[PDB]
């Protein structure tokens, strides 16, 4: 009802968007092909709600494409595939608070380091003359 009329007894309070995380950073992923996006989860009501919504977890994004998603509302770090960033050539990722209502804005784009983006390699060598 676009400014029409109402009456039917109904109480529906506004929910979300859920408060987005902060202090986003990339430490290191269990594997050389992944990373660890660490962040600080905002206090959740004594009932299980961030900004009025039911936070079920978080979600990592690079260039608008969900690369990773942790089903943990109290998660302070999640693993993300680096390859997913290559195809898109994304030099940074973000964390969004996922809830039953939807998702939240993109946290501080944590520019992934080039050292982690690049794969490992053994010490090279050549013709030893002197």
mmCIF file of C-alpha atoms in Angstrom:
data_model
loop_
_atom_site.group_PDB
_atom_site.id
_atom_site.type_symbol
_atom_site.label_atom_id
_atom_site.label_comp_id
_atom_site.label_asym_id
_atom_site.label_seq_id
_atom_site.Cartn_x
_atom_site.Cartn_y
_atom_site.Cartn_z
ATOM 1 C CA UNK A 1 0.000 0.000 0.000
ATOM 2 C CA UNK A 2 1.903 3.007 -1.322
ATOM 3 C CA UNK A 3 0.577 5.525 1.202
ATOM 4 C CA UNK A 4 -2.920 4.100 0.867
ATOM 5 C CA UNK A 5 -4.338 2.711 4.103
ATOM 6 C CA UNK A 6 -3.949 -0.018 6.723
ATOM 7 C CA UNK A 7 -5.591 -1.558 9.773
ATOM 8 C CA UNK A 8 -5.099 -5.311 10.065
ATOM 9 C CA UNK A 9 -3.363 -5.641 13.433
ATOM 10 C CA UNK A 10 0.280 -6.310 12.569
ATOM 11 C CA UNK A 11 3.593 -5.450 14.231
ATOM 12 C CA UNK A 12 6.607 -5.718 11.928
ATOM 13 C CA UNK A 13 9.771 -3.980 13.127
ATOM 14 C CA UNK A 14 12.564 -3.025 10.691
ATOM 15 C CA UNK A 15 15.538 -5.388 10.505
ATOM 16 C CA UNK A 16 19.034 -4.910 9.120
ATOM 17 C CA UNK A 17 21.141 -4.072 7.461
ATOM 18 C CA UNK A 18 23.501 -5.758 9.956
ATOM 19 C CA UNK A 19 26.448 -3.699 11.195
ATOM 20 C CA UNK A 20 29.409 -4.438 8.887
ATOM 21 C CA UNK A 21 32.756 -5.675 10.270
ATOM 22 C CA UNK A 22 35.945 -3.622 10.554
ATOM 23 C CA UNK A 23 39.721 -3.883 10.921
ATOM 24 C CA UNK A 24 39.766 -6.133 7.854
ATOM 25 C CA UNK A 25 43.173 -7.577 6.979
ATOM 26 C CA UNK A 26 44.867 -10.441 5.139
ATOM 27 C CA UNK A 27 47.277 -12.572 7.165
ATOM 28 C CA UNK A 28 47.757 -15.891 5.370
ATOM 29 C CA UNK A 29 45.698 -18.839 4.168
ATOM 30 C CA UNK A 30 46.363 -22.399 5.304
ATOM 31 C CA UNK A 31 47.439 -22.818 1.680
ATOM 32 C CA UNK A 32 49.607 -20.757 -0.705
ATOM 33 C CA UNK A 33 46.550 -20.456 -2.946
ATOM 34 C CA UNK A 34 44.354 -18.891 -0.264
ATOM 35 C CA UNK A 35 44.348 -16.117 2.336
ATOM 36 C CA UNK A 36 42.927 -15.318 5.771
ATOM 37 C CA UNK A 37 40.675 -12.254 5.905
ATOM 38 C CA UNK A 38 40.727 -11.266 9.577
ATOM 39 C CA UNK A 39 38.231 -8.720 10.899
ATOM 40 C CA UNK A 40 36.462 -7.518 14.045
ATOM 41 C CA UNK A 41 32.815 -8.618 14.417
ATOM 42 C CA UNK A 42 30.477 -5.993 15.932
ATOM 43 C CA UNK A 43 28.811 -6.800 19.255
ATOM 44 C CA UNK A 44 25.588 -8.765 18.788
ATOM 45 C CA UNK A 45 22.485 -8.178 20.907
ATOM 46 C CA UNK A 46 21.946 -10.569 23.846
ATOM 47 C CA UNK A 47 19.479 -12.386 21.593
ATOM 48 C CA UNK A 48 21.551 -12.864 18.455
ATOM 49 C CA UNK A 49 21.257 -9.761 16.286
ATOM 50 C CA UNK A 50 23.675 -7.140 14.960
ATOM 51 C CA UNK A 51 21.572 -4.219 13.730
ATOM 52 C CA UNK A 52 18.185 -5.892 14.061
ATOM 53 C CA UNK A 53 18.837 -8.755 11.655
ATOM 54 C CA UNK A 54 19.809 -12.377 12.293
ATOM 55 C CA UNK A 55 23.493 -12.643 11.382
ATOM 56 C CA UNK A 56 24.274 -16.202 10.296
ATOM 57 C CA UNK A 57 27.738 -15.455 8.946
ATOM 58 C CA UNK A 58 29.901 -13.247 6.745
ATOM 59 C CA UNK A 59 30.831 -13.060 3.073
ATOM 60 C CA UNK A 60 34.031 -12.149 1.244
ATOM 61 C CA UNK A 61 33.929 -10.287 -2.069
ATOM 62 C CA UNK A 62 36.602 -9.171 -4.533
ATOM 63 C CA UNK A 63 35.194 -7.496 -7.643
ATOM 64 C CA UNK A 64 31.497 -7.999 -6.964
ATOM 65 C CA UNK A 65 31.736 -11.788 -7.004
ATOM 66 C CA UNK A 66 31.298 -13.749 -3.775
ATOM 67 C CA UNK A 67 34.592 -15.609 -3.370
ATOM 68 C CA UNK A 68 34.115 -16.916 0.169
ATOM 69 C CA UNK A 69 31.439 -17.083 2.866
ATOM 70 C CA UNK A 70 31.687 -18.076 6.529
ATOM 71 C CA UNK A 71 28.533 -19.317 8.252
ATOM 72 C CA UNK A 72 29.770 -17.818 11.520
ATOM 73 C CA UNK A 73 28.384 -14.564 12.982
ATOM 74 C CA UNK A 74 31.212 -14.409 15.519
ATOM 75 C CA UNK A 75 33.892 -15.152 12.926
ATOM 76 C CA UNK A 76 36.983 -12.939 13.026
ATOM 77 C CA UNK A 77 38.772 -14.619 10.118
ATOM 78 C CA UNK A 78 37.888 -16.705 7.064
ATOM 79 C CA UNK A 79 39.716 -18.448 4.223
ATOM 80 C CA UNK A 80 39.414 -17.230 0.633
ATOM 81 C CA UNK A 81 40.685 -18.599 -2.679
ATOM 82 C CA UNK A 82 43.358 -16.419 -4.282
ATOM 83 C CA UNK A 83 42.674 -17.829 -7.749
ATOM 84 C CA UNK A 84 39.232 -16.217 -7.668
ATOM 85 C CA UNK A 85 41.005 -12.865 -7.359
ATOM 86 C CA UNK A 86 43.352 -13.613 -10.257
ATOM 87 C CA UNK A 87 40.672 -14.051 -12.920
ATOM 88 C CA UNK A 88 39.186 -10.759 -11.727
ATOM 89 C CA UNK A 89 42.611 -9.289 -10.969
ATOM 90 C CA UNK A 90 41.221 -7.903 -7.712
ATOM 91 C CA UNK A 91 43.807 -6.173 -5.521
ATOM 92 C CA UNK A 92 41.545 -6.196 -2.478
ATOM 93 C CA UNK A 93 38.610 -7.904 -0.781
ATOM 94 C CA UNK A 94 35.728 -6.928 1.500
ATOM 95 C CA UNK A 95 33.627 -8.518 4.243
ATOM 96 C CA UNK A 96 29.838 -8.275 4.454
ATOM 97 C CA UNK A 97 27.710 -9.353 7.418
ATOM 98 C CA UNK A 98 25.336 -12.050 6.172
ATOM 99 C CA UNK A 99 21.973 -12.480 7.895
ATOM 100 C CA UNK A 100 18.502 -13.963 7.423
ATOM 101 C CA UNK A 101 17.413 -10.585 6.057
ATOM 102 C CA UNK A 102 20.252 -10.259 3.564
ATOM 103 C CA UNK A 103 23.743 -8.770 3.500
ATOM 104 C CA UNK A 104 25.527 -5.609 4.640
ATOM 105 C CA UNK A 105 27.798 -3.061 2.960
ATOM 106 C CA UNK A 106 31.375 -3.956 2.030
ATOM 107 C CA UNK A 107 33.859 -3.529 4.879
ATOM 108 C CA UNK A 108 37.210 -1.772 4.490
ATOM 109 C CA UNK A 109 38.582 -3.191 1.239
ATOM 110 C CA UNK A 110 41.617 -5.117 2.476
ATOM 111 C CA UNK A 111 44.157 -4.842 -0.342
ATOM 112 C CA UNK A 112 45.660 -8.328 -0.579
ATOM 113 C CA UNK A 113 49.486 -8.410 -0.547
ATOM 114 C CA UNK A 114 51.409 -9.375 -3.712
ATOM 115 C CA UNK A 115 53.537 -11.797 -1.694
ATOM 116 C CA UNK A 116 50.500 -13.954 -0.917
ATOM 117 C CA UNK A 117 48.948 -13.557 -4.367
ATOM 118 C CA UNK A 118 52.088 -14.941 -6.008
ATOM 119 C CA UNK A 119 52.716 -18.704 -5.715
ATOM 120 C CA UNK A 120 55.815 -20.218 -4.056
ATOM 121 C CA UNK A 121 59.001 -21.068 -5.950
ATOM 122 C CA UNK A 122 62.298 -22.865 -5.213
ATOM 123 C CA UNK A 123 65.628 -21.025 -5.189
ATOM 124 C CA UNK A 124 66.795 -20.744 -8.823
ATOM 125 C CA UNK A 125 70.346 -21.429 -10.003
ATOM 126 C CA UNK A 126 72.567 -21.381 -13.075
ATOM 127 C CA UNK A 127 76.019 -22.308 -14.425
ATOM 128 C CA UNK A 128 78.468 -22.002 -11.532
ATOM 129 C CA UNK A 129 81.810 -20.799 -12.891
ATOM 130 C CA UNK A 130 83.395 -19.014 -9.946
#
